[PDB]
């Protein structure tokens, strides 16, 4: 469903139409927010970033809408949501571990978001970036938003700090994102953002 949707999406070739498209699409994704957003964050983003065949699509200005789409659905999912419908509660019993290798809880949405962010940081690596550098740029840009609470950024041995350090080479945007709770961990990224 979402695959064919995003496939039909990249045809406008004009920012306004793509904007209206993603605007209507965020709404059409309602009534199934949890599972739809899970499947999206799990497949549709790696489905283009992991390989080069689908990289061709990511170069489009629709890519900015796709980034906006991703951050919007992530924010909506992380936010409080009951979503209890008859045709949904009667069909909300499956099994999935997501095989999310770890090399503040155990929740499918949170784990999928962590895996997604890890893959973002990995794609942010060097030695190849034609289309996806702009993708992660737009992602980080649209992620910046007031009244938001996503991008928790665990601070044990994780990428987000090095990720922000690298994104600084593409000024104070990440200087605000990484500042989770003014913890001593944030002192490092603050010093790096001092420049």
């Amino acid at each position: 469903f979402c695959n064919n949707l995003i496939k039909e999406l990249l045809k406008e070739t004009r920012k306004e139409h793509t904007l209206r498209a993603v605007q209507l699409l965020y709404s059409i994704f309602c009534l199934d927010m949890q599972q739809v957003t899970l499947v999206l964050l799990g497949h549709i983003l790696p489905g283009l970033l992991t390989d080069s065949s689908k990289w061709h699509s990511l170069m489009d200005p629709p890519g900015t809408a796709l980034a906006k789409l991703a951050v919007w659905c992530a924010l909506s999912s992380y936010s409080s949501h009951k979503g209890q419908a008859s045709s949904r509660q009667k069909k909300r019993h499956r099994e999935d571990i997501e095989d999310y290798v770890s090399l503040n809880m155990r929740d499918p949405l949170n784990r999928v978001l962590a895996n997604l962010f890890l893959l973002i940081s990995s794609i942010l690596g060097s030695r190849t970036a034609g289309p996806h550098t702009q993708f992660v740029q737009w992602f980080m840009e649209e992620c910046v938003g007031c009244l938001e609470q996503d991008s928790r950024g665990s601070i044990l041995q994780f990428m987000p700090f090095t990720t922000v350090s690298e994104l600084v080479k593409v000024s104070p945007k990440v200087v605000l994102a990484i500042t989770d709770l003014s913890l001593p961990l944030g002192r490092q990224v603050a010093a790096k953002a001092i420049a």
Partner: protein
């Protein structure tokens, strides 16, 4: 002189080159009959693993690591971590006055690279007249370098200019 055999032997150019066997290997087997040509253990293994995974071709690091202890080379935030991997920060430590480190961002190993770009040129150089003269002598000597070589020529010329600063 005995070239009659040459062209007629060269006649057998096309793909069906098997009859040569029936022409030579019996007579060969008369004189040379060796079963022991390569009986030792032998097997073809094309590749096992091949990648740098740490930096550019080794030659640059291998050569720069051989420099004097008077120079102190390090790396800035990795904005070209894999392909470029060249933006050096150096600290002259000797019997001379210290100064600002250079940029030193090079190109592929062909080395048509005047690597330093002086990212902090303006404000760091407008500070004092002495270091301004140092910079002037630096750029004047760099212009004199014909096809400069980032590996050694850059740091050597910079050290020479820093040692020329004492007038």
């Amino acid at each position: 002189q005995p070239l009659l055999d040459a062209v007629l032997a060269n006649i057998r150019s096309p793909v069906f080159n098997h009859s040569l066997y029936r022409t030579f290997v019996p007579a060969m087997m008369a004189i040379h009959g060796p079963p022991i040509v390569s009986p030792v253990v032998c097997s073809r293994k094309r590749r096992f693993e091949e990648d740098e995974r740490q930096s550019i071709p080794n030659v640059l690091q291998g050569e720069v690591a051989r420099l004097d202890p008077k120079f102190l080379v390090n790396l800035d935030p990795s904005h070209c971590s894999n392909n470029g991997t060249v933006h050096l920060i150096c600290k002259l430590d000797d019997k001379d006055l210290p100064s600002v480190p250079p940029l030193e961002l090079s190109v592929p190993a062909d080395y048509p690279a005047q690597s330093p770009m002086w990212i902090d040129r303006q404000w760091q150089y407008d500070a004092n007249p002495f270091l301004q003269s140092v910079h002037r002598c630096m750029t004047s000597r760099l212009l004199q370098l014909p096809d400069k070589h980032s590996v050694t020529a850059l740091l050597n010329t910079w050290a020479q200019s820093i040692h020329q600063a004492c007038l």
